[PDB]
């Protein structure tokens, strides 16, 4: 049945995007650490930053691995109820990963902002863009959580089908907003590196 296989295929693609975004995020973290070791903003605060980074990085990896497991199960089910259930759970997995990545992304904005305080005016214009996309992704996440709740409720007790399709749209929108934020943090870091020494 092509509708559901089409959703499973798109879920694989969203997960792939999440992994590529995790990779970029990780590079931004490393880049921020290199800059901080040179610039040295303010230290216990940076130790807690580092701890938080490590916590969320661990979380994200676990979510990605669980998503990879669920993806494999759904693709098995396609060959084989359980499919709809697995598709909903995969939407939950992807949403948790996006939420955790968004927190990680906000930790890098914190780091970038601490550094740009010492290298000092298009920071304010960079700020406005960060805020705009932060608000957008927050509202997309909020809407995605509500939809997930409705789908899960219906799954237990179609509005289910419609809710699943709309949730695909919600997730992709949020991943797309995250991409824009990543381009913004990449820009901020290059701009900082260009100004040192």
């Amino acid at each position: 049945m092509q509708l559901l296989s089409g959703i499973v295929q798109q879920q694989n693609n969203l997960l792939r995007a999440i992994e590529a975004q995790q990779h970029l995020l990780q590079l931004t973290v490393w880049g921020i650490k290199q800059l901080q070791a040179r610039i040295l903003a303010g230290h216990t605060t940076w130790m807690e930053w580092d701890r938080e980074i490590n916590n969320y990085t661990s979380l994200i990896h676990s979510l990605i691995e669980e998503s990879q497991n669920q993806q494999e199960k759904n693709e098995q089910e396609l060959l084989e109820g359980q499919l709809l259930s697995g598709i909903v759970q995969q939407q939950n997995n992807l949403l948790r990963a996006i939420e955790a990545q968004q927190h990680l992304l906000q930790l890098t904005v914190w780091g970038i902002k601490q550094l740009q305080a010492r290298i000092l005016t298009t920071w304010m214009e960079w700020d406005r863009e960060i805020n705009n996309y932060t608000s957008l992704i927050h509202s997309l996440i909020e809407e995605s959580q509500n939809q997930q709740e409705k789908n899960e409720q219906e799954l237990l007790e179609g509005q289910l089908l419609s809710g699943i399709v709309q949730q695909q749209n919600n997730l992709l929108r949020a991943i797309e907003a995250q991409q824009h934020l990543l381009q913004l943090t990449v820009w901020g870091i290059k701009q900082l590196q260009a100004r040192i020494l």
Partner: antibody
């Protein structure tokens, strides 16, 4: 993936710049370290660059002696080591890490560049 | 971070080899293991928590407990004779670090 420039013979006090041309991935997804090995000895990490930002950090032992650079249009990383001494005699490797988002290990290595420092 | 490895370890063909590396601090996921043969570049054998790259035999596995990582080679072959290095990264500073290396001899 990683092809380095040829062997070098240098005198104490000179400089050497070693190159590493990367082929077959996405440049902006690269992360490189330089790593050296004296003959019969262990590996010694020298420093890193993240080419998409051009950000670097170096082991403290080499602060003020080593520069790591990368060029996107030629897809090449460089290590320049100044004020050479006989103890800098070693094979020098470029190495790429972050092959995937959770691979911090060095997945790809250059063939190595021997640099012999002698009066 | 200072990573301590035994200078040498020896094994009989078919016997299991275990090479320790002590000294890393959390997160241990930054760590990796390398095989190096004479006149060759090092080869990544394990990264993070027992992840094997493509083309690396299943007989190689990584484990960890506290500040001590262990490379295990079950049913070791003569071709497993090599230097093995552990490495990791310091979390705050992203300084790399290698252990001193372990020469593995397969007896025969």
């Amino acid at each position: 993936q990683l092809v380095q420039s040829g062997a070098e013979v240098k005198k104490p006090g000179s400089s050497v710049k070693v190159s590493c041309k990367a082929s077959g991935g996405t440049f902006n997804s690269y992360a490189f370290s330089w790593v050296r090995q004296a003959p019969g000895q262990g590996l010694e990490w020298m420093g890193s660059i993240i080419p998409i930002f051009g950000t670097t950090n170096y082991a403290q032992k080499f602060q003020g002696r080593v520069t790591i650079t990368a060029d996107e249009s030629t897809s090449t990383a460089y290590m320049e080591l100044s004020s050479l001494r006989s103890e800098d005699t070693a094979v020098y490797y470029c190495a790429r890490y972050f092959d995937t988002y959770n691979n911090y290990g060095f997945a790809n290595w250059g063939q190595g560049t021997l640099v012999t420092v002698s009066s | 971070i200072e990573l301590t490895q035994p200078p040498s370890v020896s094994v009989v063909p078919g016997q299991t080899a275990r090479i320790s590396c002590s000294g890393d601090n959390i997160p241990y996921e930054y760590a990796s293991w390398y095989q190096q043969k004479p006149g060759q570049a090092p080869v990544l054998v394990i990264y993070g928590d027992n992840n094997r790259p493509s083309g690396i035999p299943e007989r190689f596995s990584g484990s960890n407990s506290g500040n001590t990582a262990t490379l295990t080679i079950s049913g070791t072959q003569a071709e497993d004779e090599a230097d093995y290095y552990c490495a990791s990264w310091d979390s705050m500073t992203v300084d790399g670090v290698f252990g001193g290396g372990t020469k593995l001899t397969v007896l025969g």
